[PDB]
Amino acid sequence: KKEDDPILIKKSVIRRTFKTAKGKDRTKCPKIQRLITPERILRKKVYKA
RNA sequence: AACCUGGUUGAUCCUGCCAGUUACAUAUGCUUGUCUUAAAUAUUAACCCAUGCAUGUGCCAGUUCAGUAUUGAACAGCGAAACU
Ligand SMILES: [Mg+2]
Ligand SMILES: [Mg+2]
Ligand SMILES: [Mg+2]
Ligand SMILES: [Mg+2]
Ligand SMILES: [Mg+2]
Secondary structure (H helix, E strand, O other): OOOOOHHHHHHHOOOEEEEOOOOOEEEEOOOOOOOOOHHHHHHHHHHHO
């Protein structure tokens, strides 16, 4: 849902899991762009200031 | 260094050039031992060109699910590619 909490977006992002050519075991995650974080809102407040 | 000398006649004083002398550029011939500098395919053909190189660029501050590393379970170090 749109009304939904950002942390629900955080928890639902896909994980990638894979085996390195070296034979190692690793897991990679994407970063969320557009995400509403405290930092965005702070910057906004400061500009209006 | 504000200087001139040789050549017309049988001899002479003139005009006048030629020639010498001087510097400086290219060129060249012979000859070349140190040290300090150092121009350099302008002139002829803005003629023709094999090959190599002479224009690239990343920070903490645009984009990383590359990779690496057993990394704050959204990423967070290092760091391609590729957008910008
Ligand atoms: Mg006469
Ligand atoms: Mg005579
Ligand atoms: Mg003369
Ligand atoms: Mg010596
Ligand atoms: Mg690059």
